[PDB]
């Protein structure tokens, strides 16, 4: 299983995650690849940032879900 | 305005429910800002009832 991580700018990242994993884990991996602070990056999905430390089951996240990431730094 | 449409597109995919009309309205007013506009939109989807 893997979920897509599309950035506000224009870049998607594939991250492998277990169905019974956790959103927090996803943030950690994304941070490892890009190297962006978790606080700065906003993991938006289903019209709202996913809560850290929450199993996919709750949000009922499917496979290859396109999660949006918006950087807090700069921008508006 | 010059390339806000791209940002608007992000909004469309960002919120699979908000009408394009609303996205365009807020986007235009908020000086085509995504961080602030979206930031507020995130909390909005707190709970229907």
Curated annotation (Swiss-Prot), chain A:
Residues 1-76 form the Ubiquitin-like domain. Coiled coil: none annotated. Changing residue 29 to R: Deficiency in ubiquitin-protein conjugate formation. It is found in: Cytoplasm; Nucleus. There is a cross-link at residue 76 (Glycyl lysine isopeptide (Gly-Lys) (interchain with K-? in acceptor proteins)). Changing residue 48 to R: Deficiency in ubiquitin-protein conjugate formation. Exists either covalently attached to another protein, or free (unanchored). When covalently bound, it is conjugated to target proteins via an isopeptide bond either as a monomer (monoubiquitin), a polymer linked via different Lys residues of the ubiquitin (polyubiquitin chains) or a linear polymer linked via the initiator Met of the ubiquitin (linear polyubiquitin chains). This is Ubiquitin. It comes from Saccharomyces cerevisiae (strain ATCC 204508 / S288c) (Baker's yeast). The gene is RPL40A. The chain holds residues 1 to 76 of 128 of the full protein.
Swiss-Prot record, chain B:
The chain holds residues 6 to 54 of 443 of the full protein. It comes from the Eukaryota. This is Endonuclease CUE2. The CUE domains specifically bind RPS7/eS7 polyubiquitinated by MOT2/NOT4 and HEL2. mRNA endonuclease involved in the No-Go Decay (NGD) pathway, which catalyzes mRNA cleavage and degradation in response to ribosome collisions. Acts downstream of the ribosome collision sensor HEL2. Specifically recognizes and binds RPS7/eS7 polyubiquitinated by MOT2/NOT4 and HEL2, promoting CUE2 recruitment to stalled ribosomes, where it mediates mRNA cleavage upstream of the colliding ribosome. Residues 3-46 form the CUE domain.
């Amino acid at each position: 299983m893997q979920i897509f991580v599309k950035t506000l700018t224009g870049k998607t990242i594939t991250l492998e995650v277990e169905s019974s994993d956790t959103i927090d884990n996803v943030k950690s991996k994304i941070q490892d690849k890009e190297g962006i602070p978790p606080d700065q990056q906003r993991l938006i999905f289903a019209g709202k940032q996913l809560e850290d430390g929450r199993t996919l089951s709750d949000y009922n996240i499917q496979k290859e879900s396109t999660l949006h990431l918006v950087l807090r730094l700069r921008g508006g | 305005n010059d390339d806000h449409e791209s940002k608007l597109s992000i909004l469309m995919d960002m919120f699979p429910a908000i009408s394009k009309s609303k996205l365009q309205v807020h986007l235009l007013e908020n000086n085509n800002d995504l961080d602030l506009t979206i930031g507020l939109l995130l909390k909005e989807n707190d709970d229907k009832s």
